[PDB]
Design a protein around this ligand. Sequence first.
Ligand SMILES: Cn1cc(CNc2cc(OC[C@H]3C[C@@H]3c3ccccn3)nc3ccnn23)cn1
Ligand SMILES: [Mg+2]
Ligand SMILES: [Zn+2]
Length: 321
Amino acid sequence: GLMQFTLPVRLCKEIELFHFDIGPFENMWPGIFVYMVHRSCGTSCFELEKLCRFIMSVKKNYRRVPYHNWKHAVTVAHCMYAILQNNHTLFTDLERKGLLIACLCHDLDHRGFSNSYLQKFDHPLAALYSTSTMEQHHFSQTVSILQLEGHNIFSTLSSSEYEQVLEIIRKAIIATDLALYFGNRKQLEEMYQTGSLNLNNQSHRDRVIGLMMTACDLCSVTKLWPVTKLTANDIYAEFWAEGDEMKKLGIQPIPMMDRDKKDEVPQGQLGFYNAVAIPCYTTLTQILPPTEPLLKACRDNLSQWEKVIRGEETWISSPSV
Ligand SMILES: Cn1cc(CNc2cc(OC[C@H]3C[C@@H]3c3ccccn3)nc3ccnn23)cn1
Ligand SMILES: [Mg+2]
Ligand SMILES: [Zn+2]
């Protein structure tokens, strides 16, 4: 069915924008990924049959959790697409191929639990992966799908190329562990301000790709306010379900995972934008100046959350609950 799809003409110009919301086009999501791949590395970068099998099996391996689901994978892949389009010659053909695939696969088989939850409650995944637990699992799941019959989209590559893509993918998925972001951004800020940042330097390149992954992972803060607000509802529905699990086990969750502490969400979002999102997009803009619309949109949403705290603004936009 995916092989048969044709993209509506109105979306041609829309899909190119950073603030584009995929939300209203659920039936078109696999096709939108195909179109993005074709615009990023050409119609003859992957065999259509293999790509469509890959996409559909990835979709199947995303659980029906409130936030880390199929919609999130495609949202993240679209932000990466827009980043790559606006800085096309900075990245190699191999990087473009790997990063779009890494974004689509970055939360594969997510169970709706944080790494701290899995580590604290001795889940088998935490026994197997000591650090970046879920992220190591997401990469493993990606490899398994590639290893399926008719799914190896990277078969036509040389081994120095295949091992190279699988490493670009591995590093990119691990980088989505938010615990790793803080040190990565601090490092890049230092390299930029001292003028030592060199994109020809592989260590430096891996760090920039890392920041790109964080920037894509949190891109809901870069959408129009009604979209940002609606995604925040999904993010907290997932945090609150994990908090509910801790409460059944007699443990008090931190306020961000406590549904009885909803009033702390606007202050919680202000803190997150100030300590996480704003520095992320600020650093990204400095390194890749065409990414400035993400920083601009993030600042607008920071102002909206400031208005919510001040009582100047109010979930879902509906006359009835
Ligand atoms: C579900 N999930 C999402 C992610 C990462 N992405 C993410 C997390 C996040 O955490 C906000 C809570 C820390 C704030 C808080 C502190 C105290 C009280 C209330 N809130 N906010 C946002 C906005 C856009 N993306 N995003 C990781 N698992
Ligand atoms: Mg993740
Ligand atoms: Zn994610």
